[PDB]
């Protein structure tokens, strides 16, 4: 029974860490949307120029 208990003790703290970590990662992708539009603009500009 002690063996079961010890596992759960360590889990209780550490899971809160993962919880934060996941949301932090997601934030980076929000900012990635700004990046994505930059990628697009570069592609379009190069394409028109290539045709010229």
């Amino acid at each position: 029974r002690i063996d079961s208990v010890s596992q759960l003790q360590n889990v209780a703290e550490t899971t809160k860490v993962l919880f934060d970590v996941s949301k932090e990662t997601v934030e980076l992708e929000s900012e990635a949307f700004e990046l994505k539009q930059k990628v697009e603009l570069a592609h379009e500009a190069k394409a028109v120029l290539d045709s010229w």
């Binding site: 029974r1 759960l8 899971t15 919880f19 996941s22 949301k23």
Partner: protein, 85 residues
Amino acid sequence: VSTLIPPKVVSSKNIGSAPNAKRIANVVHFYKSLPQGPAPAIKANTRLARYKAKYFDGDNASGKPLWHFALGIIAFGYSMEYYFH
């Protein structure tokens, strides 16, 4: 996306484990047991708890009380033989 919150609730591995039944048993059984006892043989104390101590302890199955009690019955009817004589 954000990791789900089921692992942050435990109340089904804490009450949901089989040794819990044993735990609540052996906190009562063992905690509430005197580590030592009073005295093994003491019945008939009047210098005959001494008879019990020498003969009717679980430290011996020695034939001496049997002999003594047998000799008592030999002494009983034999004395009465000389009382009936």
